[PDB]
Amino acid sequence: KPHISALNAPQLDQRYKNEFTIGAAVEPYQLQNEKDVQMLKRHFNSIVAENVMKPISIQPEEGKFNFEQADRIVKFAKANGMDIRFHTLVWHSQVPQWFFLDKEGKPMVNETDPVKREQNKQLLLKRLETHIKTIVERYKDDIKYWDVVNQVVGDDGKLRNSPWYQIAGIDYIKVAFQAARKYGGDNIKLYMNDYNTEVEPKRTALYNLVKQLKEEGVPIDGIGHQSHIQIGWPSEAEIEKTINMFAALGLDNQITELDVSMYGWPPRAYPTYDAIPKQKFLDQAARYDRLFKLYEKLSDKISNVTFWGIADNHTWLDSRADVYYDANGNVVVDPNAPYAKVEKGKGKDAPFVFGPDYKVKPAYWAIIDHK
Ligand SMILES: O[C@@H]1[C@@H](O)[C@H](O[C@@H]2CO[C@@H](O[C@@H]3CO[C@@H](O[C@@H]4CO[C@@H](O[C@@H]5CO[C@@H](O)[C@H](O)[C@H]5O)[C@H](O)[C@H]4O)[C@H](O)[C@H]3O)[C@H](O)[C@H]2O)OC[C@H]1O
Ligand SMILES: [Cl-]
Ligand SMILES: [Cl-]
Ligand SMILES: [Cl-]
Ligand SMILES: [Zn+2]
Ligand SMILES: [Zn+2]
Ligand SMILES: [Zn+2]
Ligand SMILES: [Zn+2]
Ligand SMILES: [Zn+2]
Ligand SMILES: [Zn+2]
Numbered sequence: 001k002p003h004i005s006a007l008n009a010p011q012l013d014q015r016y017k018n019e020f021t022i023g024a025a026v027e028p029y030q031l032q033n034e035k036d037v038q039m040l041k042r043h044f045n046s047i048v049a050e051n052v053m054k055p056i057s058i059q060p061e062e063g064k065f066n067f068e069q070a071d072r073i074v075k076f077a078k079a080n081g082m083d084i085r086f087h088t089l090v091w092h093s094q095v096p097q098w099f100f101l102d103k104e105g106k107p108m109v110n111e112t113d114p115v116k117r118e119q120n121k122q123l124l125l126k127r128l129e130t131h132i133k134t135i136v137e138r139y140k141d142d143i144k145y146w147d148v149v150n151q152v153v154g155d156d157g158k159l160r161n162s163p164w165y166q167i168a169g170i171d172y173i174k175v176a177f178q179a180a181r182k183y184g185g186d187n188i189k190l191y192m193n194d195y196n197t198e199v200e201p202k203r204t205a206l207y208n209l210v211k212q213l214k215e216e217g218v219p220i221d222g223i224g225h226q227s228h229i230q231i232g233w234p235s236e237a238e239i240e241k242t243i244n245m246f247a248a249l250g251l252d253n254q255i256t257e258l259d260v261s262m263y264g265w266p267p268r269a270y271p272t273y274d275a276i277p278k279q280k281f282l283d284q285a286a287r288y289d290r291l292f293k294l295y296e297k298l299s300d301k302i303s304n305v306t307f308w309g310i311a312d313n314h315t316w317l318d319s320r321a322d323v324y325y326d327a328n329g330n331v332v333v334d335p336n337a338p339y340a341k342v343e344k345g346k347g348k349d350a351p352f353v354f355g356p357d358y359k360v361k362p363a364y365w366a367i368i369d370h371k
């Protein structure tokens with residue numbers, strides 16, 4: 001099956017249109033890149049901001065709101081009949097730090113006096129409410145799906161002990177969802193989003209958290225499974241079990257940040273795309289074949305599958321593609337093997353079904369057929 005230009009291959013959204021939308025994460029510069037635009041128009045019917053809707057992009061100083069970059073995604077989406085997802089209202093990752101400073105500019109995590117800690121809690125929660133309010137009041141008629149909180153459960157199975165949690169405890173999660181529902185109304189759909197949702201003890205900690213929150217009337221419509229996965233891990237059986245277990249709570253599932261890395265963890269990458277052997281693309285294609293067959297089997301529990309980029313020329317996985325060199329300067333990709341130094345984030349991953357030249361990969365054929 002040939003390595004033809006994606007730009008006029010059979011449309012990926014159309015293949016799956018009764019099963020789930022097919023989305024892509026974008027940067028605004030891609031909306032001014034001819035090829036990226038034609039890719040979005042041709043293959044996708046859902047869109048998400050990779051970065052420009054994060055808290056630090058939207059409100060980098062209190063009261064200073066930058067909607068200009070988000071607005072461009074929204075406009076493009078509306079003009080092309082795409083669903084939009086909002087990524088994300090609340091996250092621990094370089095939030096703007098002003099959220100977590102007390103009335104004197106001191107970090108709130110340092111306060112020892114209980115009455116002052118409680119005032120800080122209330123103050124952070126008010127700030128959270130205003131951030132959400134302002135965003136949802138602006139986009140509630142345009143944006144259907146919302147990542148309300150991101151990565152709030154730790155890999156150890158405990159609530160992630162971020163400044164949100166240290167200052168406000170569990171109420172930050174409750175307040176985030178209540179606020180989104182209050183200002184956005186009943187027709188926006190609210191998600192909790194996380195990675196390694198398939199993995200214990202995180203998976204059961206997430207299930208227990210969401211079950212409790214719903215029992216308490218906190219409005220949560222679904223779970224976003226970031227799905228930053230590998231060729232051989234996690235298994236399809238474990239993916240299946242995860243999806244089924246949340247759907248049994250009455251939750252929607254979205255696959256929100258799908259990519260299939262060529263590597264393991266910590267990754268030992270090839271230094272360029274050219275160096276990735278052909279067989280890796282075939283192993284990737286068989287993985288995508290199995291994965292999309294599974295998503296199709298569960299299509300009544302999954303409303304969306306979104307890739308965390310467009311084509312292999314741009315992927316955040318490159319920032320993790322560390323290149324290992326032996327003493328003679330040869331590249332090392334075997335996870336156990338000797339090496340002398342590492343160049344962090346300098347290699348090249350290849351995670352999508354579309355190549356860096358915008359031609360289809362063997363993974364594309366694996367998911368566009370009906371076998
Ligand atoms: O442009 C960039 C943006 O794209 C970027 O977007 C955000 C990045 O993605 C989301 O967060 C990251 C998800 O991946 C996590 O790493 C995990 C760590 O755990 C590993 O688990 C192991 C895998 O191998 C097994 O065998 C082992 O037993 C497991 O424990 C897993 O492989 C990794 O993927 C990162 O820590 C997260 O940050 C986020 O929501 C997107 O918004 O943001 C930055 C920007 O520069
Ligand atoms: Cl190349
Ligand atoms: Cl398939
Ligand atoms: Cl990126
Ligand atoms: Zn389309
Ligand atoms: Zn379409
Ligand atoms: Zn090449
Ligand atoms: Zn090259
Ligand atoms: Zn569906
Ligand atoms: Zn990017």
Ligand SMILES: [Zn+2]
Binds near residue numbers: 356357
């Ligand atoms: Zn190529």
Ligand SMILES: [Zn+2]
Binds near residue numbers: 357359
């Ligand atoms: Zn090519």
Ligand SMILES: [Zn+2]
Binds near residue numbers: 365370
């Ligand atoms: Zn197939």
